[PDB]
Amino acid sequence: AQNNPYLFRSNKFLTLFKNQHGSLRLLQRFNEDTEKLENLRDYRVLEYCSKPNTLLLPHHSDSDLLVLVLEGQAILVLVNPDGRDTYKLDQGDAIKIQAGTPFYLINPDNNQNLRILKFAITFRRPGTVEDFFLSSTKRLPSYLSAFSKNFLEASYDSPYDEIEQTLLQEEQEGVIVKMPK
Amino acid sequence: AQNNPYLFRSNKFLTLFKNQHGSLRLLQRFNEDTEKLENLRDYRVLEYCSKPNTLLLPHHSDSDLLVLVLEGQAILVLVNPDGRDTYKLDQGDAIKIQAGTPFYLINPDNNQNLRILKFAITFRRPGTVEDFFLSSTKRLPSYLSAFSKNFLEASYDSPYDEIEQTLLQEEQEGVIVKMPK
Amino acid sequence: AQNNPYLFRSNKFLTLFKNQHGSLRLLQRFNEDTEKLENLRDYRVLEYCSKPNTLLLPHHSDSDLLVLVLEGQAILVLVNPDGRDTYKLDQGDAIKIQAGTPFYLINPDNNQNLRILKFAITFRRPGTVEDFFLSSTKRLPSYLSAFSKNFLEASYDSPYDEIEQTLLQEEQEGVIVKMPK
Amino acid sequence: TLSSQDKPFNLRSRDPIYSNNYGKLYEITPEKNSQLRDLDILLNCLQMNEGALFVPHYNSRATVILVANEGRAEVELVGLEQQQQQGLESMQLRRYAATLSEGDIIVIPSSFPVALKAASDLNMVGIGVNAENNERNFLAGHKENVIRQIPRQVSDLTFPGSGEEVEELLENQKESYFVDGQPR
Amino acid sequence: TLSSQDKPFNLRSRDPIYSNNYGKLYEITPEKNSQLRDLDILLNCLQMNEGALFVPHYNSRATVILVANEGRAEVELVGLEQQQQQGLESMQLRRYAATLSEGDIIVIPSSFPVALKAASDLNMVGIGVNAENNERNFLAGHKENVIRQIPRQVSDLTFPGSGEEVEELLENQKESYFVDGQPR
Amino acid sequence: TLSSQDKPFNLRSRDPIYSNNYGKLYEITPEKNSQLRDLDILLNCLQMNEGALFVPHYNSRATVILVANEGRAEVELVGLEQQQQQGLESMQLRRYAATLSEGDIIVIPSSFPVALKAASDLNMVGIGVNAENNERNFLAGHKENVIRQIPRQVSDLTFPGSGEEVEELLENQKESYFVDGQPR
């Protein structure tokens, strides 16, 4: 991450978060030190690994992602404003997650761990990817959190007091969690 | 117009010209202070307002414009090398003006004033729009003016003296004028 | 080649190589001093002229080229992994050479000399074009040269000694040569 | 608008995509109109009454610029800033709120949740760029609510309460898109 | 050019788009040829006699690069410079004139009027970029004249003279595209 | 993977494009799959045995990023650097060799010859960008060899030996794409 001529060799992604059950890592911007890669300037790659029986909370990214299964098996969940489409991913499965649809991702019953690769095609903010999470956690909170008392009053038709007890929080081991069942 | 982080709030276009009957204003380049908008870098917005019974002289722009009627009613004129296509625009009309076709635009019989919005999709010169006017005025003159005596002699087959009495001029209240009838 | 406002006038390409039989010249990057041409930033132009009965050795370019015959007549050869497609070009012929296919180009039997124009549409490295030559010459050698002893041993199944006697060399008057027959 | 029809012949309205009471929205997309089809824009007309919150949402692909034709608006935009940053928690969470008004322009990126407030009777024009494919996902309201889709077991895991407790909080608002802004 | 035809098989000529006397123009567009079709280029061959002005015009979309194959040319380009400027009158009006000649290249932006002069017998190649959709509008001549379309009432309002006085000045030149450059 | 099938329904394998012995390659292209079709990517799975050189080649259009899923790889990339340089001989000829390994990523530009070496049993994923239209041209091996196409008279002129002497050197390797890396 910083000033190399023409190096077409990468081995270090920066970590977004990591913990007892998993990790989300993100590669340095391709067009980084070399100018030898302005044609990749828009693409980004994230690696991902969760221990058995874990969860990636619901979230949506601004970038179109092409998900690909390197190791494990997963239960992917694509949520849209009318229902869901759910899928059991296997070593070698590749799925395409459009921008902005929220999705949660789970490693099942296992011993076998989950390693997924995410190739991201960015637009909004060239070579910049951003995910948004519903739930509050210590990394950051809910985007919902960002609104106004009334904004949440009117929208919701529930006093703020009851908006925040399903708003702000202590989900600790953050964005990757251990599942109950 | 100058150095703000991530401000997605704009209220000041710079004026191209203004006068007794009208005005043409142009928004600061979107990708201006924020880097938060490189994806808009190419688009530009102009606002426009003419008093009743006025004219925007004939002109052509290098950029493709998408015209849209906010207030008033207009008579738009699209000139191409074989004739015209003319249209009566109403509150809410949206028309698409290709690049390079000349067009003149008029506010009719009214009391009601004309407010038009122009969303410009640029190419030639990314986020740069340029209109060209036939007639000479104090802002600038005719592009025709720019040529050579002979160039206008040969082309036209009329002495320069008679080229300029339908060339250079005093149309005063400039690019927006009051109509006779 | 360096700092002019808005000059839409170009007359000097830099030479890639030149000699007794020919020449390959390359125009300064369009988006060079003027900013008035960022929309051309990707395109490049090469001129080319060979004396009668000469050769442009086999090579491939990273950029898509659109070849065009200004003067002479040529025998163009398009090589792909299964055979060839060969063509007799005449004053005014225009052919499209995809990226990466190797091609060799020849001026026939003549007195009449060959002048070809190459308009290059770049991608990989915006406004950057690169050709690769099989044969070793004093300009540069074979790309093949760049490999490893074993790499050439395994690949080829011939000792290095016999790889280089059909590898490295003395083709002197370089990339443009005189033909035997 | 002549019977020799066929060009870049002018355009205007159809059934609003979200009419209601509290307010309406008309919207010409690119997939249903040719002069924008090759333009990639989305155009949309937003009309609302004194006090009708446009409820938290975010467009998937489109980046919408909005101008205040008539009225007074309270916009509240929400953000996570630049990923020339490289650190989760190390990011930002920002709320951009402006009371816009006849004249002003608000830019509205493609995934960033938004909510409006119609302080005066409102007329707004939307020029959406990066059109082909846009979807509007809602985080409040009765139709197209997405918080309303995360299954039960997950909601428990996701929001500071629970499966059953989300499902309520959620429909405690029997209204669509534009609702009552009436504070207390 | 073999009967196993079908590729990126080579290309050359058809009826010039503007033949005449004073000069001619051949031009392969992208909409009528596939190897450029996906290339977006326009290719065009311009031949003229000692003294045949190519008369003021401007291409709508295409940006054309022109090389002097054979001859001597007097180009006269016209401009309004950078809108990282923000002021109407505060702009520029420039005339770029060069006598080009076998060797040289002239770049010709998409709306900027141009006129040529064939000082010697000319052969010019045009590589137009931003092709799909280009139109050539003329400001002089008899066919495709555009100053010849602004209606009467408007011409009065537009040019330093009048309705009737434009309509004349205008056809006082019964010729097309390439005309006589003969000065006085 | 449900019988209500039809979406961005997931994808995986078909007949490798190059199976063999020494190793195999599976590869989903954009022209044969829709979720990438509009994505422009090429995806490809590369499996090889302890010691199976992937033989010198270069992709025409596509720029491929490769990650080491499982194993140890010896990559040897070949180059001519920046043409913000303007001088033939005045260029560079570089060889970038890295022994990559489970974790690492190698970027592989579109015309630059490459060769691999499977130091351990290998599993590699290829994410190719700039897909639509890619061709893989080989400089070694029996199938799709290109040094094997330059006609006779030319080879003489091209490589430090001769017509007859190239044609041999060439097929002194009766194998395809992945061959024996066994040194001496």
UniProtKB/Swiss-Prot annotation, chains D, E, F:
Location of the Cupin type-1 domain: 9-167
Subunit field text: Homotrimer.
Function noted in UniProt: Seed storage protein.
Similarity comment text for this entry: Belongs to the 7S seed storage protein family.
Name used for this protein in its record: Canavalin
Upper classification of the organism: Eukaryota, Viridiplantae, Streptophyta, Embryophyta, Tracheophyta
